[PDB]
Amino acid sequence: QETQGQAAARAAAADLAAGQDDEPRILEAPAPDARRVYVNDPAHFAAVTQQFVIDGEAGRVIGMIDGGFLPNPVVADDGSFIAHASTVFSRIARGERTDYVEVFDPVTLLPTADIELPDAPRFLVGTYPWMTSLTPDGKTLLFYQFSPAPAVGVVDLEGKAFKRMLDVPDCYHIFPTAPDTFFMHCRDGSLAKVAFGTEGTPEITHTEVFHPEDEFLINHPAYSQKAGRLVWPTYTGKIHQIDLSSGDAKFLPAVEALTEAERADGWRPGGWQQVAYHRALDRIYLLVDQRDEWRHKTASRFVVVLDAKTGERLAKFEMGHEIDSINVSQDEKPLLYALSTGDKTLYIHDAESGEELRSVNQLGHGPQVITTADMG
Amino acid sequence: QETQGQAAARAAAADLAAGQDDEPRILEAPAPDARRVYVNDPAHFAAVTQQFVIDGEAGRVIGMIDGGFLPNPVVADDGSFIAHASTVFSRIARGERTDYVEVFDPVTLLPTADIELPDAPRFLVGTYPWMTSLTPDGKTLLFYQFSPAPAVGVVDLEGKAFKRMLDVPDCYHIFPTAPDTFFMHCRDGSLAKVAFGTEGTPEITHTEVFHPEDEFLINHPAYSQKAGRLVWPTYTGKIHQIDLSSGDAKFLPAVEALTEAERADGWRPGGWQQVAYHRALDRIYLLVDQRDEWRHKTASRFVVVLDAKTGERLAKFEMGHEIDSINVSQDEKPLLYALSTGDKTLYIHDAESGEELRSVNQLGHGPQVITTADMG
Amino acid sequence: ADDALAALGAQLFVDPALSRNATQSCATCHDPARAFTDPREGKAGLAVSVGDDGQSHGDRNTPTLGYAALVPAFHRDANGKYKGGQFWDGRADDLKQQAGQCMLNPVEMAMPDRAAVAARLRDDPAYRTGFEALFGKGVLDDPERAFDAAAEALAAYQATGEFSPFDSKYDRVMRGEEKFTPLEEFGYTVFITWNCRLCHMQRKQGVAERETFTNFEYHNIGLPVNETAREASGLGADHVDHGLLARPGIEDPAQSGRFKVPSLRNVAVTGPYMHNGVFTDLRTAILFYNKYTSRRPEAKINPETGAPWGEPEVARNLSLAELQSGLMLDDGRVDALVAFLETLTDRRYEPLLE
Amino acid sequence: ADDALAALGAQLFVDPALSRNATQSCATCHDPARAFTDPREGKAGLAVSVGDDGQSHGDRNTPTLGYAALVPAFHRDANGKYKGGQFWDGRADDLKQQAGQCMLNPVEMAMPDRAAVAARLRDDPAYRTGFEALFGKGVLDDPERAFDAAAEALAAYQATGEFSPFDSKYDRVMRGEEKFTPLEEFGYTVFITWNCRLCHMQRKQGVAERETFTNFEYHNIGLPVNETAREASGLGADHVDHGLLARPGIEDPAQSGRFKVPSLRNVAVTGPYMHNGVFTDLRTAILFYNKYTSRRPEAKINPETGAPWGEPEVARNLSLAELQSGLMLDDGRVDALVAFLETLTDRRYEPLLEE
Amino acid sequence: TDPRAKWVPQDNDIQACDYWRHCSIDGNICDCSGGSLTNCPPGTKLATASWVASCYNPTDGQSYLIAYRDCCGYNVSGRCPCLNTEGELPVYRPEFANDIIWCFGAEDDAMTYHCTISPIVGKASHHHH
Amino acid sequence: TDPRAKWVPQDNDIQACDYWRHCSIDGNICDCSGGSLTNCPPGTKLATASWVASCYNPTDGQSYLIAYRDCCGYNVSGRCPCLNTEGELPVYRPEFANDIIWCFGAEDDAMTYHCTISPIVGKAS
Ligand code: HEC
Ligand code: HEC
Ligand code: HEC
Ligand code: HEC
Ligand SMILES: [Ca+2]
Ligand SMILES: [Ca+2]
């Protein structure tokens, strides 16, 4: 009921009236919990950008992070650190380029590491969460390189050093499974398992081709590292689930998110981060609206929810705003996060009822990526 | 009558119909002329900023210049180059500070100079045009320093190099009058005349104290280097005119920009660049509105025009938008330029009639500074 | 007169009487069965052609006459770039100049002078009837007029629809007659979006009426000497082929090592490749562009020789802005470019693709 | 009992019978005419005070007792900063402890022990009546009880309105009774916005009920040795005054060189300045802070000696975050601060401002 | 301005997101920051790399291949922002993908995104679009 | 929201530009980016320098000196932007001047502007 701003005013008035002293100082962020959410703002390709740290429970900004050009955010699942891979230039957007990785303390937000990436190797793209990835332990960060060829950078966060670039075939995104292993997704429709011992070529094994040339898998799949679950929508609402918990790719039964009659009446996924996945509930959330086939990057006004095992639509939400990206907290009875690039606002809903609970406006210029820690 | 976006789609379809070929390439901006105008976007304190180079006649953006943190723009009157003093950091807004000057070619907009300023000596303040200033011959840039003490830095544009800091008294702003001389406004209500060599305690002389401690002189006086005219409003719209043409300060009669009845009914100057001066017409323009006495940075909807010799009012335009800054082209039949910070839009008016002619929108986040060249 | 002129060019084109010892015609090195290239083996393979005397080798690969008539006359344009002309170095203004020079070149057709050509034309009854009808009576007695008329006929012949038929699969696809295979289509897309289109399209932008996959400019792509051709040509191991700078009247050293961008039409059937026939395979020639973009060690290697490409013959004036695209062609895209380029084969030469 | 106890303190305060050779009272070094400071010239000027024996010089400037009652008892607070106490080094917990220590210090009042103090008290008929009424019969026969009672009385007397009258011009201005002169107004403004306020205001934020222009903390501002006082005190040329680290039970080397932030009330009349009386002039004590901020050569120079300020006596633990403000006081603001601090003079000491 | 409705090309205003050549533009139209339909503004660097789309020309009912090339080395213009996705494919088909910053081959290794030009490079003949 | 009308203090919401302590704030309220009324957000650096204003407290009818201090070394927050100018003087009286970036004295020489805190440092007069 009473906004955090009114309670603050009373806290402050009571402090004045009762004559409590207090030293002005640098605050510390509340300990990282399940309901903390990070929102990044790519700022429509601006040279400098902002990450926002938000308490999702109280709907309050609890700190921010600065970043260069189209940075890659990662959040350590256990809560122990966040990090990004970022890019600056000597003269704003011109001159000498330095790509680097920062590792931050998650309560002070002070950088605890600055690791320069040689030869400016970063993939400069509209932000895809899985183009830079943490490994299960958090001892290695890997990132995508596109030029001259698809490649993957190995960075050692623990020894605070870049290590080497890995040769890979024509493949995309990085989904790590082990301290020395990850899958990517290749042009030919397969997944590649890439496993690297430091010292020369990695072992490369492709899976089976799992989708046709003319079925289109989106830029923003959802992946649970703790669950080994990858959830890849196609432009049509079809959902490829691949389970990686064995060490190798097992393909689950594909499942439609949109009924036959809904598709015929112009229903399609659309937005940015269009899909979310809840680990403990084994449950899938997806942004949908009525749209033309090539408006796949536009805001949607409805979220659908379905059982990953069966595909049974568990609820349809009317969201009430133009939503671009969704995600969920991984606690019991989670929050559904719905971010509007247009509104610059994160809307926070109950992932059971879908009723809007509270919202955090003024998050930069074009916020697009929502990240959460999976802490249990 | 017809927009420039339409005349290009008309011209474009004619090339595609005629098999007219053309090499994609980097445009040259048109030659600098009287009607060219520069709009700076301090961006409400953002770590990186923009300048928009504009053709006032067509109301077309012709080019842009990237800046750092509160850069100070200059424009050489004769049209031969523009420049800025600017500030960057190795990690966006954190890390090692580098302050530098850039000189730009005005047609290619390539930088022809990049001069470092040792010990990061720029005053970081919301942008005041006369905190960084060109000598009349265009050979030296002077910048103001506030920390640890008021001081004035000397930068040799010809030899492309930082010269020295000058110690000055507790004064503010820089109005150059000769290759080797400039004036400042001191806390004590005098103006200081500063004359400087390659070494030497500079010769410093003070005029009469010309206003009491409680007459308030705005951060944005208009200064015309070629007339030697400094036009200085107070909070009330009383205007001090100083004539530095002879190389010493002569004081003209003070004029009231608003009548005693307009003052009784709450009329005050207010906004950012509140005053403009046209040299050939010897004419003053003041942004004014009804406002409380402490709302002097808010926008204004009215411009009043007065003969500088007499104080006689010539016109009271109603701008029809919220206006923070004004300036004028220095040719015959001048343009009154009018910038909305709120609207991020430059309105381009006939200075004689006040009629709005055209507008240029989308000028960044918080545009505030208009600069013109006096080429006449 | 247009049919007739060309018809005379036709006879002349296959007449070995225009070579010093009457051993070769234009058709000998510009063989119609091979897209008007040389199919003959010499000391350097198919890289260079053997002259009239049966021993003399050129230093340059004989190129296709297919589509040559589309090339504008030689000129410097408004921004200082030379365009057009004939020969790998632009030393001939046009098809007509070019005919004369080839006829006189001593390591090739090797006629002593315009007068010797005139005598040979005068000897033949069909040439008297044919030339006199087009150029007036007694044309053949004026060594100058005769030689110039022959050159003109030859030029007119190469402007016939037959030398530029625009009947490739690519041409049919653009008329909507057929579709590309998905491989070919990927090829074309790669070609129009990668650096290839910066030199092997007629125009910078817009649509060409008769595209021949060249902008007629001059570039140094930094090729090595073809060691066996250079030995065979007998020009010497110290000799440097200066490309355009060799054209008389070109003094600018920035032109050194630059060669006419060749049309890609019929490229699949006109190996070996480049101005000195250094690469036998179409795939190699593509893979060569990877030397400027790729970080993999295999890119520094000529898959034909299993050894580094070799130092450029001329190390200056490289077209680095274009060639260092920052993007590397993977094996997929090289396959695709091959499939695309093969669709540029004239209908009559499709059997040769096998 | 409160009046009475204080009234006893008053008698004790001016009684030279609490010195070994009966030559000096508290009022001798803490003279009421001079804001409870020492007006007497010794071997080092007014920098340090002369003891009961007529020769022994202290190493520290005698400070005002005005407003000393406002200082909290000595303690370490939750963030590890020591606050409060008495003496420049905090070696006394409160006014009561401090009274006892001054009485026993051999370079000053120099009583041999608590028993000697007891004997002296016992000797005087008015003390018997006065102590026994407040502490019980036979108090004076118990050396411990007697001495403790004496200190208590001295302490209670320094808590009277008279030592902290809050009647300065600054106090009148805050009550709305008068205005500041524009110079003084500018001075006050400079004082609240520049670094001075980080150490010489009671609170970090908020308003103090009884402001005494000190946060009661411990800081090393990097002062040099006062050479003539150090010679006079005879502690030796190798001696280092460690400030708070000298307090028994403080072991932390980060405290070394730190001194209690003095109340700026009555500062205009209590020269010379700092814990060692090193500067004679108020203006110099202000200018000193410019050594950390200014780039001008003149800022290195003590205007009194015309020579560099000198190496800090203790080179570690300097309060650099506070002192290096990046902003230099020009002559204007120095004059202004002088005008402001002068306003902090007690009503009864305004006549003294003139000299 | 139903953002989800099928995109409707016009051939009358190049500074608007519904101009026909912009059918797969991402970012900003260079004509709005001192460039032109097919040239870069002063001070920026013209890349050699592109993404293509086939864009329908409502004027002549023909489809043309548009190679989008970026003008780089400057902060994003902030003027005339657009994003359309006709035939736009996922990143693994980078020929047709427009989230990628196509600044490869720009002078001085400029890689920051300022604006995008829309030159025609051929007549279309396509299979997914 | 007549921007030209006399400014009207409230003592009930700190995140609003009409909160009484913000009577000469320039920039952004720190409470909106993870600080509080009188503290900086994590990662930023607290300046030691200020500009003051006397701000009327509509709760107690008293006027308090407010020393605005900047939190620096981060790009501008973008949240709760505000600009008020009660008693604000031109730059030549820097004590009362609020276009100046008052980041002096911040740890690590941070000088970029993030947000401004509003602590009381005295009663006005
Ligand atoms: C082998 C002995 C040849 C004979 C016989 C003819 N040509 Fe030729 N031709 C030959 C070579 C090695 C070259 C390239 C030489 C160089 O230095 O560039 C050529 C070139 C041409 C060209 C130019 C095509 C282009 O540059 O794109 C033309 C138009 C041409 N030749 C025509 C031509 C004619 C008309 C001939 C008979 C008169 C003739 N060639 C004979 C090799 C040989
Ligand atoms: C200018 C910077 C070029 C670009 C970019 C590409 N090509 Fe090129 N090509 C160019 C020249 C000047 C030449 C001849 C150079 C010489 O010295 O001989 C060529 C040649 C080819 C060939 C051989 C054709 C033949 O010998 O008849 C092929 C097959 C070719 N080029 C293909 C090609 C491809 C696939 C490109 C994109 C990777 C490409 N070229 C770019 C000039 C330029
Ligand atoms: C802590 C960081 C302080 C700052 C900031 C300022 N002062 Fe200070 N002051 C401080 C201490 C610990 C002391 C005693 C130092 C010692 O070891 O002797 C002082 C002393 C003074 C005095 C003289 C007091 C006296 O002898 O009675 C004055 C006049 C004084 N300080 C003024 C002052 C001014 C004007 C400041 C802003 C420029 C200032 N101090 C800052 C601690 C600190
Ligand atoms: C001359 C010798 C005397 C005498 C006769 C008295 N004092 Fe007092 N005093 C003197 C000095 C040199 C100092 C500073 C000592 C140091 O830091 O080592 C003091 C200090 C005090 C204080 C503390 C004030 C403060 O720290 O802010 C008090 C409260 C005090 N002195 C009181 C006092 C009493 C009660 C006396 C009679 C018992 C007395 N002084 C005498 C020098 C001298
Ligand atoms: Ca060939
Ligand atoms: Ca003293």
Tokens of A125: 């793209």
What the block records as the tokens of A338 is 């719905």
Which residue of chain E is at minimal alpha-carbon distance from C179?
E125
Q: Which two tokens stand for residue B319?
A: 């701008």
Structure tokens at D276: 């060692």
Residue E6's nearest CA partner among E21, E22, E18 is E18
What tokens were used for D286?
């202000």
- The residue from E20, E31, E70, E102 that is catalytic is E70
Alpha-carbon distance C57 to C59, whole Å? 7
| Chain C positions in Cβ-Cβ contact with residue E97 (cut-off 8 Å) | none
Residue B189's contacts (CB-CB under 8 Å, 6 or more residues apart) are B209, B210, B211, B212, B213
| Maximum pairwise Cα distance, chain C | 68
Total Cβ atoms within 10 A of residue D126: 10
Measured distance CA(E19)–CA(E37) in Å, rounded: 11
CA distance linking residue C46 with residue C37, whole number of Å? 10
Distance C301 CA to ligand 2 centre (A): 18
What is the rounded distance in angstroms from the CA atom of residue A135 to the CA atom of residue A138? 5
Q: Count the helix, strand and coil residues of chain D and give each as a percent rounded to the nearest 5.
A: 40, 10, 50
Which positions in chain C touch B22 (Cβ < 8 Å)? 204-206
CA-CA-CA-CA torsion for C51, C57, C59, C61, nearest 10 degrees? Answer: 60
Residue B160, helix vs strand vs coil: coil
Which two three-digit tokens encode residue B144? Answer: 């103001």
Amino acid at D335: D
* Stretch (H or E) spanning A73: strand A72-75
Please answer whether residues F11 and F91 qualify as being in contact, where contact means their C-beta atoms are separated by less than 8 angstroms.
no
| Closest to F55 measured CA to CA, from F92, F17, F107, F104 | F17
CA distances from A262 to A267, A269, A287, A300, C47 (A): 5, 11, 14, 15, 64
Quick check: CB of C285 below 6 Å from ligand 2? yes
CA E120 vs CA B5, E22, E54: distances in Å? 18, 11, 10
Phi, psi (degrees; rounded to nearest 5) at D201: -130, 140
* Chain E interface, best mutation among B64, B66, B112, by max E CB count within 10 A: B64
Q: What amino acid occupies position F113?
A: Y
Residue A217 tokens read as 């898998």
- Identify the domain containing residue F65 by its residue range: 1-125
The H-or-E segment that residue B17 falls in is helix B4-18
Judged by CB atoms closer than 8 Å, whether chains meet at B19 and C205 is answered as no
Give chain B's end-to-end CA distance (angstroms, integer).
30
Q: Is C287 in the pocket of ligand 2 (CB under 6 A)?
A: no
Contact by Cβ (8 Å): B314, F19: no
Using a CB-CB cut-off of 8 Å, the residues of chain A touching B90 are 88
User: Does residue C282 come out as left (phi exceeding 0), alpha (psi in the -120 to 50 range) or beta?
Assistant: alpha
Residue of minimum CA distance from atom 5 in ligand 4: D26
Determine the Cα–Cα distance for residues E96 and E91; give it in Å rounded to an integer: 8
- Can you give chain C as a three-state secondary structure string? CHHHHHHHHHHHHCCHHHCCCCCCCHHHHCEHHHCCECCCCECCECCCCECCCCCCECCCCCCCCCCHHHCCCCEECCCCCEECCECCCCCECCHHHHHHHHHHCCCCCCCCCHHHHHHHHHHCHHHHHHHHHHHCCCHHHCHHHHHHHHHHHHHHHHCCCCCCCCCCHHHHHHCCCCCCCHHHHHHHHHHHHCHHHHCCCCCCCCCCCCCCCCCCCEEECCCCCCHHHHHHHCCCCCCCCCEHHHCCCCCCHHHCCEEECCCCCCHHHCCCECCCCCECCHHHHHHHHHHHCCCCHHHHEECCCCEECCCCCCCCCECHHHHCCCCCCCHHHHHHHHHHHHCCCCHHHHHHHC
Chain B contact present for D353, CB below 8 A: no
Dig out the tokens for A291 from the structure. 């749209």
8-state DSSP, F31: G
CA distance E77 to F33: 27
Strands in chain E per DSSP E: 26-28, 45-57, 62-72, 81-83, 113-117, 120-123
What are the C-alpha distances in Å from E23 to residues A266, A267, E31, E53, E96? Answer: 20, 22, 16, 7, 12
Q: How far is the CA of D188 from the centre of ligand 4 (A)?
A: 30
| Cα D222 from Cα D309, distance rounded (Å) | 10
CA dist., res. D67 & res. B287, Å (int): 54
CA of E70, closest CA in chain A: separation in Å?
12
Domain regions of chain A by residue span: 1-376
CA distances from D38 to B318, C140, D44, D63, D286 (A): 72, 134, 13, 8, 22
Contact (CB<8Å) A91/B66: yes
The single-letter DSSP state of residue B30 is P
| Tally of CB atoms within 10 A around D161 | 9
Distance CA B196, CA A47 (A): 40
* Residues in the annotated binding site of D: 26, 29-30, 196, 199-200, 275
Three-class DSSP category at A211 = coil
DSSP alpha helix (H) spans, chain A = 4-17, 260-264
- Alpha-carbon torsion angle D250, D254, D256, D261, nearest 10: -90
Longest Cα–Cα distance of chain F, Å, equals 41
Closest CB from E3, E87, E91 relative to A219: E91
CA angle D63, D64, D69 (to 5 degrees): 115
Nearest to D192 among F67, F104, F105 (CB): F67
Q: Tally the C-alpha atoms within 13 A of residue D164's C-alpha that lie toward its C-beta.
A: 17
Judged by a CB distance cut-off of 8 A, whether residue B204 touches chain A is: no
State whether the beta carbon of D95 lies less than 6 angstroms from ligand 4: yes
Distance C88 CA to ligand 1 centre (A): 10
Q: Which of D55, D65, D51 lies closest to D23 in space, CA to CA?
A: D51
Structure resolution, Å: 2.5
* Interacting residues of F31 by C-beta distance below 8 A, sequence separation 6+: A5, A8, F14, F15, F37, F80
Q: Closest residue of B to C210, CA-based?
A: B19
CATH of the domain at F74: 2.60.30.10
Token readout for A264 is 């015929």
> How remote is the C-alpha of F18 from its chain's centroid?
12
Residue D258 backbone phi and psi in degrees, to 5? -90, 140
Count of CA atoms in the C-beta half-sphere (13 A) of A105: 12
C-alpha span between A126 and A367 (Å, rounded):
11
Give the span between the Cα atoms of F103 and F105, in whole angstroms: 6
Closest by Cβ to E121, choosing from C173, C176, C205: C205
Please list the residues that pair with F20 across neighbouring strands.
Answer: none
Chains C and B touch (3+ CB pairs under 8 A): yes
Whether residue B148 has a cis bond before it, omega within 30° of 0: yes
Specify the DSSP class assigned to residue A170.
Answer: S
Residues C57/C42, Cβ–Cβ less than 8 Å: yes
Residue B88's DSSP bridge partners are: B98
Asked if residues E37 and E68 have their Cβ atoms less than 8 Å apart, the reply is: no
Domains, in order of start, for chain D: 1-165 (1.10.760.10), 166-355 (1.10.760.10)
- If DSSP codes are grouped into helix, strand and coil, which group holds residue D203? coil
Evaluate whether B95 touches F72 at the Cβ level (below 8 Å).
Answer: no
CB burial of residue E78 (10 Å; 0-12, 13-18, 19+): buried
Residue type, B248: D
Kindly give the residue spans of alpha helices, DSSP state H, lying in B243-353. 260-264
Does A213 sit within 8 Å of C332, measured CB to CB?
no
Interface contact D204-A23, CB threshold 8 A: yes
d(CA A329, CA A318): 20
- Residue A335 CA to residue B193 CA, distance in Å, equals 66
User: Is C196 annotated to bind ligand?
Assistant: yes
C213 CB neighbour count, 10 Å cutoff: 22
Establish if C294 touches chain A: CB-CB under 8 angstroms. yes
Q: Cβ contact (<8 Å) for E38 and B27?
A: no
User: How many Å apart are CA D344 and CA A66, to the nearest integer?
Assistant: 47
B94-104, strands of its sheet edge to edge:
B72-75, B82-91, B94-104, B111-117
Domain B1-376: give its CATH code. 2.130.10.10
Contact with chain A for residue C183, Cβ under 8 A? no
Q: Which amino acid does the sequence have at A353?
A: S
Ligand showing the shortest atom-to-Cα distance for residue C34? 5
C299: CB partners within 8 A, 6+ apart = C287, C290, C291, C293, C328
Task: Look at chain F and report how many structural domains it folds into.
Answer: 1
The catalytically annotated residue of B52, B69, B104, B183 is: B69
Q: Which atom of ligand 1 is nearest to the CA of C108?
A: 2
> Of B92, A324, A367, whose CA–CA distance to F79 is shortest?
A367
Mutation test of ligand 4: which of D8, D24, D30, D94 has the most ligand atoms closer than 8 Å to its C-beta? D30
Q: At what angle do helices D95-104 and D143-158 cross, to 10 degrees?
A: 120
Place of tokens 């003093």: B85
Q: DSSP letter for B157, please.
A: T
Indicate which technique resolved this structure.
Answer: X-ray
Q: Return the H-helix or E-strand segment holding B14.
A: helix B4-18
* Sign of the CA dihedral with A96 first, then A98, A99, and A104 last: negative
d(CA A352, CA D79): 45
User: Which letter does DSSP use for residue A86 in this model?
Assistant: E
Specify whether the CB–CB gap between D89 and D98 falls below 8 A. Answer: no
| SS3 state at E108 | helix
- Report chain B residues touching chain E, CB-CB < 8 A: 3-6, 8-10, 12-13, 16, 22, 24-29, 48, 50, 53, 60-66, 107-110, 362, 364-365
Rounded Cα distance, A230 and A240, in Å: 8
Query: Radius of gyration (Cα) for chain D, nearest Å?
Result: 21
CA D261 / ligand 3 centre spacing (Å)? 7
CB of E74 within 8 A of CB of E114?
yes
Report how far ligand 3's centroid is from the alpha carbon of D200 (Å).
7
CA distance linking residue A325 with residue D102, whole number of Å: 74
Cis peptide leading into residue C272 (ω within 30°): yes
The SS3 assignment for D17 reads helix
To which residue do tokens 């009921």 refer?
A: A1
Of chain C, the end-to-end C-alpha distance in Å amounts to 40
- 3-state DSSP assignment of residue A192: strand
DSSP-derived 3-state class of residue E77: coil
Alpha-carbon span E25 to E34, nearest angstrom: 18
The reply to whether residue A12 touches residue F37, judged by beta carbons under 8 angstroms, is yes
| Cα three-residue angle A106-A108-A112, rounded to 5 degrees | 70
Evaluate whether chains B and E are touching (3 or more beta carbon pairs less than 8 Å apart). Answer: yes
Q: Please indicate whether, in this complex, the C-beta atoms of A148 and C294 are within 8 angstroms of each other.
A: yes
- Confirm if B255 and B307 have CB atoms less than 8 A apart: no
Q: Do C205 and B22 touch (CB under 8 A)?
A: yes
Please state whether at least 3 CB pairs lie below 8 Å between chains B and A: yes
